[PDB]
Amino acid sequence: SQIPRLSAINDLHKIWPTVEEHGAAIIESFLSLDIVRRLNEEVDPFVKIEPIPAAKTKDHPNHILSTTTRLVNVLAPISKAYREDVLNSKVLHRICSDAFHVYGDYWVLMGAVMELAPSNPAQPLHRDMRFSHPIVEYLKPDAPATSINFLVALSPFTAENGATHVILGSHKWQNLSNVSMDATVRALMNPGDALLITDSTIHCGGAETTGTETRRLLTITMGISQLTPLESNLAVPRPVIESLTPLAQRLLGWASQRSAAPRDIGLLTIRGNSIEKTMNLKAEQPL
Amino acid sequence: SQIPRLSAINDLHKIWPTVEEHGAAIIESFLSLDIVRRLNEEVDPFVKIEPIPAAKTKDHPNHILSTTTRLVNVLAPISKAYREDVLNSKVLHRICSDAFHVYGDYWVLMGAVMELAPSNPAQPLHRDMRFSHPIVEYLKPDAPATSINFLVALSPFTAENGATHVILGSHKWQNLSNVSMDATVRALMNPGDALLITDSTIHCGGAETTGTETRRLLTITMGISQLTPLESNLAVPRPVIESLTPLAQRLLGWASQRSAAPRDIGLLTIRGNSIEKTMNLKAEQPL
Ligand SMILES: COc1ccc(/C=C2/C(=O)Nc3ccccc3C(=O)N2C)cc1
Ligand SMILES: COc1ccc(/C=C2/C(=O)Nc3ccccc3C(=O)N2C)cc1
Ligand SMILES: [Br-]
Ligand SMILES: [Br-]
Ligand SMILES: [Br-]
Ligand SMILES: [Br-]
Ligand code: NI
Ligand code: NI
């Protein structure tokens, strides 16, 4: 049985309940082709200048990604398309509030463009967050997902060019003795489609087998405001931050956050006041 | 059997193992009387101007604390004693690395001075973090503590003036049917002494019964860098931040963080580089 495919528009209310049951769902046209084009254009140069993931110049090397793989994060100051269109996506926010209502507010743990070179091997079958958030492994088996991953196609995803593998129902697995590529199904997607998985879904990047095709994806890990993001926006110029919506500002950690606790005392507060109130942080000021 | 009392100096290695077994330990002379005096002096005015915890002017009201209670957090820009002496405490850092080695880096979830007025009632018996981090309630019963609380006496703690109550062994309790003030013992302390509890230790602020005494404490919640702090240092002037040690800077979230994962990819990074490297953040520049 294949990965369930849903309309971003007409099947909006069905998307999270589908992921909660099956551990994966394809969101058809998650981003318009216009947004994909503008996103591809803005990140293109930064992909090319990006050193190898485990560069000796880096003080936080990624020793896991293929040496041919390029990951570009902190996209806000690079991409008008990302910081305006993607951060304000009505579909992403309905899904996130559906997923995270039991915990409270959510924000971006990481928004990264990844480019995978021709002949990039398949990743080992894995769950995300194990190289950054050891805490996640100490949660009760039945604990609701504290993070989810929108794997957005920025180029075609085919079995040939290394489309994502998922094991359906694997997000509910405690015994991992049946973990095999034999058990996987593929995420076949056009640019703008998104594969949505949880932090518990067993999955892997597919093997690039054409030897010619470059695969690119926008990976948006959304998580509860109680978990620390992989990436920082602390160094993003204040002018760029003050050009965003209040919603987009909160997702980048440039606002206080709230838990779902009946009498919440809040996160990232300043003597009972919010970041945005204290600093007199403006919003929607065109640069 | 009473709360175990240990020397900050000669019993350093014994402190965390004592808390892990009993759920509480008194650290005698955790801060020198000089540091307490300088801390009391610097915060004094900010305590007096602090509105009631649930002020209608506040966008993050605390509806839990007594209306007579005053809490002052984000202490770094207020107190030279706090940002230099307390944030660099050799005893606090040995205890925190002992406690949190399984998770990775740790930082300040909140450093607050609390002043409790004459005739302040005893708090209900509780565990901390339940009004800010719902996630903590979904951790496995045996999961190591993700946060700990140094309750430092800034004035004398007596049974008369509302010294802290703790139930010893209560940090290992799953069944809460025996939770009663009958089961508690008191934290009798001179200024500079600290009661160290975990996020699981059942405890409460004592009742002020003299009708004359004002009790004050410095509460330092230390937690793994994977959990979001209650308070923000985002609005702290860069000159003040650049006057701290690199260690103190990390504790305030003005640096990238690392997990204990063998091939850690890190937290609050910028395209494989740290906050401090990217921003060229200086340290120990006297204002
Ligand atoms: C070649 O095999 C791999 C490579 C990566 C992972 C998984 C991760 C991870 O857990 N988190 C993220 C989340 C978003 C984007 C990237 C990553 C990432 O870098 N790693 C290391 C697994 C297997
Ligand atoms: C009158 O009864 C109470 C009042 C407070 C708590 C507990 C908390 C809490 O969970 N976290 C902290 C941590 C440090 C300092 C203060 C607080 C705080 O404000 N609350 C609400 C319990 C019982
Ligand atoms: Br890879
Ligand atoms: Br992938
Ligand atoms: Br109180
Ligand atoms: Br107390
Ligand atoms: Ni993955
Ligand atoms: Ni408490």
Side-chain angles (χ1 to χ4, degrees):
Chain A
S1 54
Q2 299 307 302
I3 303 175
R5 317 187 65 98
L6 300 173
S7 178
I9 323 140
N10 312 325
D11 299 334
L12 177 53
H13 58 95
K14 299 181 168 158
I15 292 165
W16 172 246
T18 303
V19 175
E20 193 291 326
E21 178 167 19
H22 298 304
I26 306 261
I27 308 159
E28 290 183 4
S29 306
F30 171 68
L31 298 181
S32 76
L33 262 190
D34 179 55
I35 292 161
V36 166
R37 183 194 61 81
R38 288 198 291 118
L39 222 163
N40 278 327
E41 205 137 359
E42 289 167 334
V43 304
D44 266 344
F46 293 91
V47 171
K48 291 181 153 180
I49 77 102
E50 186 56 30
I52 55 147
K56 283 163 175 200
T57 49
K58 288 173 176 167
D59 52 2
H60 293 270
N62 186 325
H63 297 294
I64 316 294
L65 296 174
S66 305
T67 63
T68 56
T69 299
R70 298 300 180 266
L71 190 146
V72 174
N73 63 17
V74 189
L75 288 170
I78 296 165
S79 176
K80 185 181 165 78
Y82 177 84
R83 73 181 168 249
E84 293 190 3
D85 291 281
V86 179
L87 286 189
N88 289 295
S89 158
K90 189 181 152 173
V91 170
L92 174 135
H93 283 292
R94 172 51 183 279
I95 293 167
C96 280
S97 55
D98 279 346
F100 298 132
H101 67 278
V102 296
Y103 291 121
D105 278 354
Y106 57 86
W107 59 6
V108 178
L109 296 196
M110 184 168 64
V113 170
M114 295 184 65
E115 199 163 81
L116 312 152
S119 313
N120 187 50
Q123 304 182 319
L125 286 168
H126 67 271
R127 298 171 157 160
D128 289 340
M129 301 287 285
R130 269 61 184 173
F131 301 108
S132 61
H133 296 80
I135 187 177
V136 164
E137 204 65 54
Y138 290 84
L139 292 175
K140 286 167 180 175
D142 297 334
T146 56
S147 66
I148 63 181
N149 200 337
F150 294 82
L151 299 161
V152 188
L154 290 181
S155 59
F157 278 37
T158 71
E160 294 86 60
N161 74 1
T164 320
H165 298 246
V166 309
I167 303 164
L168 296 183
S170 64
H171 67 312
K172 300 171 179 290
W173 288 16
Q174 292 171 222
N175 186 24
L176 300 197
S177 66
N178 300 336
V179 172
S180 175
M181 293 299 276
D182 292 357
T184 64
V185 293
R186 307 299 299 274
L188 312 175
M189 291 192 290
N190 314 121
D193 298 344
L195 165 71
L196 180 54
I197 61 166
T198 76
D199 69 313
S200 288
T201 310
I202 302 168
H203 68 287
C204 63
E208 204 307 287
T209 66
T210 64
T212 66
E213 284 201 64
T214 297
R215 196 166 63 84
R216 184 188 284 184
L217 66 97
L218 172 57
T219 173
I220 311 170
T221 304
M222 300 304 304
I224 66 174
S225 300
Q226 293 155 60
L227 290 177
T228 305
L230 277 84
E231 77 185 347
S232 170
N233 295 283
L234 183 57
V236 175
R238 189 159 161 160
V240 170
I241 298 300
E242 287 190 326
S243 78
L244 311 181
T245 59
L247 181 49
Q249 284 178 343
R250 192 200 85 204
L251 256 56
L252 297 190
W254 279 80
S256 300
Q257 320 278 320
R258 295 174 193 278
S259 74
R263 293 178 296 174
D264 170 61
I265 64 180
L267 305 162
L268 299 179
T269 63
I270 310 175
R271 318 201 186 127
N273 291 305
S274 69
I275 285 160
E276 57 272 27
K277 164 160 184 211
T278 303
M279 299 182 80
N280 196 18
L281 193 67
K282 305 161 197 147
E284 319 206 46
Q285 311 291 318
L287 288 169
Chain B
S1 54
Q2 299 307 302
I3 303 175
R5 317 187 65 98
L6 300 173
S7 178
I9 323 140
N10 312 325
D11 299 334
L12 177 53
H13 58 95
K14 299 181 168 158
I15 292 165
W16 172 246
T18 303
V19 175
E20 193 291 326
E21 178 167 19
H22 298 304
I26 306 261
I27 308 159
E28 290 183 4
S29 306
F30 171 68
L31 298 181
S32 76
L33 262 190
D34 179 55
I35 292 161
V36 166
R37 183 194 61 81
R38 288 198 291 118
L39 222 163
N40 278 327
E41 205 137 359
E42 289 167 334
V43 304
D44 266 344
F46 293 91
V47 171
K48 291 181 153 180
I49 77 102
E50 186 56 30
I52 55 147
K56 283 163 175 200
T57 49
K58 288 173 176 167
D59 52 2
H60 293 270
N62 186 325
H63 297 294
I64 316 294
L65 296 174
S66 305
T67 63
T68 56
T69 299
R70 298 300 180 266
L71 190 146
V72 174
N73 63 17
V74 189
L75 288 170
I78 296 165
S79 176
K80 185 181 165 78
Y82 177 84
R83 73 181 168 249
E84 293 190 3
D85 291 281
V86 179
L87 286 189
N88 289 295
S89 158
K90 189 181 152 173
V91 170
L92 174 135
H93 283 292
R94 172 51 183 279
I95 293 167
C96 280
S97 55
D98 279 346
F100 298 132
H101 67 278
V102 296
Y103 291 121
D105 278 354
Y106 57 86
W107 59 6
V108 178
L109 296 196
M110 184 168 64
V113 170
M114 295 184 65
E115 199 163 81
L116 312 152
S119 313
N120 187 50
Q123 304 182 319
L125 286 168
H126 67 271
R127 298 171 157 160
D128 289 340
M129 301 287 285
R130 269 61 184 173
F131 301 108
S132 61
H133 296 80
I135 187 177
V136 164
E137 204 65 54
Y138 290 84
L139 292 175
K140 286 167 180 175
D142 297 334
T146 56
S147 66
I148 63 181
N149 200 337
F150 294 82
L151 299 161
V152 188
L154 290 181
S155 59
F157 278 37
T158 71
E160 294 86 60
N161 74 1
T164 320
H165 298 246
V166 309
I167 303 164
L168 296 183
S170 64
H171 67 312
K172 300 171 179 290
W173 288 16
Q174 292 171 222
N175 186 24
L176 300 197
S177 66
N178 300 336
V179 172
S180 175
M181 293 299 276
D182 292 357
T184 64
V185 293
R186 307 299 299 274
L188 312 175
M189 291 192 290
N190 314 121
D193 298 344
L195 165 71
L196 180 54
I197 61 166
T198 76
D199 69 313
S200 288
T201 310
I202 302 168
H203 68 287
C204 63
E208 204 307 287
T209 66
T210 64
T212 66
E213 284 201 64
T214 297
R215 196 166 63 84
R216 184 188 284 184
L217 66 97
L218 172 57
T219 173
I220 311 170
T221 304
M222 300 304 304
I224 66 174
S225 300
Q226 293 155 60
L227 290 177
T228 305
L230 277 84
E231 77 185 347
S232 170
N233 295 283
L234 183 57
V236 175
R238 189 159 161 160
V240 170
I241 298 300
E242 287 190 326
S243 78
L244 311 181
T245 59
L247 181 49
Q249 284 178 343
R250 192 200 85 204
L251 256 56
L252 297 190
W254 279 80
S256 300
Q257 320 278 320
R258 295 174 193 278
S259 74
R263 293 178 296 174
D264 170 61
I265 64 180
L267 305 162
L268 299 179
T269 63
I270 310 175
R271 318 201 186 127
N273 291 305
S274 69
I275 285 160
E276 57 272 27
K277 164 160 184 211
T278 303
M279 299 182 80
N280 196 18
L281 193 67
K282 305 161 197 147
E284 319 206 46
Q285 311 291 318
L287 288 169

